[PDB]
Structure 1
Amino acid sequence: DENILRNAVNLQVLKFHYPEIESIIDIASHVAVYQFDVGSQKWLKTSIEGTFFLVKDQRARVGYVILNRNSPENLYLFINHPSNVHLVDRYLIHRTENQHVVGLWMFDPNDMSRIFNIVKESLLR
């Protein structure tokens, strides 16, 4: 099975960058990252675009890695509270703090809705 090999390989790539990552929860292929400017009231498209990995670290904290295929700089963020993630229109809006907002666009809308649910269920106690 192709997925067994893919997941094993991907986990080693993730662990090379972030040794504290314990497992991959789910994946989405073509994700683009946007950042919200607070004072300007405007969105900015970042240089980060690639494969999205929803992950768990050694302390079961939930987060995500975007492996940037364009440039070597990747992104690893935690999802600290389920209420910090909102499915707004075609985007996942992740607000870790009032002034610190990121937006994720996934090519496949089915990935966006599945990932939203998996985020919530991964944080469910």
Structure 2
Amino acid sequence: MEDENILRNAVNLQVLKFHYPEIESIIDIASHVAVYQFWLKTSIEGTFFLVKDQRARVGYVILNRNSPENLYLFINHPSNVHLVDRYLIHRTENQHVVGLWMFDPNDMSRIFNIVKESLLR
């Protein structure tokens, strides 16, 4: 019964590449995620796509529902991502932190696993 899943992945990936041509594949998806900063809510909210790019860099795109402004960020090291309270916390080098709020708390641990397994060597 995998046809509809193959097609959905193909439509999703075609749209992603339309915005970001270097995107190579979708690793997984979380239906509804909001982005936070300090913790203050940003304008960015929508579907979260964990993606691999041309150079094998792991990252994610949120296709924003609030405006055409999307978010695309890389996860450079699996250690960059922690579960703290209700946020999936994503840290870049010198204390640059983004907080991901997953509607559905199941996706926190789920996406955390996927990110670590994507960056596993």
Q: What TM-score does the superposition give when structure 1 sets the normalisation length?
A: 0.91
CA deviation map 1:54-106 (0-9, x unaligned): 00001111000000011000000000011110011121000103331100011
- Secondary structure (helix, strand or coil) at the match of 2:40 reads strand
Partners in 2 of 1:11 and 1:124 — Cα distance?
23
* Unaligned segments of structure 1, at least 5 residues: 37-42
What is the percent sequence identity of the aligned residues?
Answer: 100
User: Which whole-Å CA distance do the structure 1 matches of 2:76 and 2:93 have between them?
Assistant: 10
Q: CA RMSD in A?
A: 0.9
Superposed displacement of residue 119, structure 1 = 0.2
**Paired position in structure 2 for 1:74:** 70
Structure 2 unaligned residues grouped into runs of 5+: none
2:45 matches 1:45: no
2:14 to 12, 25, 34: 12
- Which structure is higher in strand share? 1
- Report runs of 4+ in structure 1 exceeding 2 Å deviation: none
- Structure 2 length-normalised TM: 0.94
Paired residue for 2:50? Answer: 54
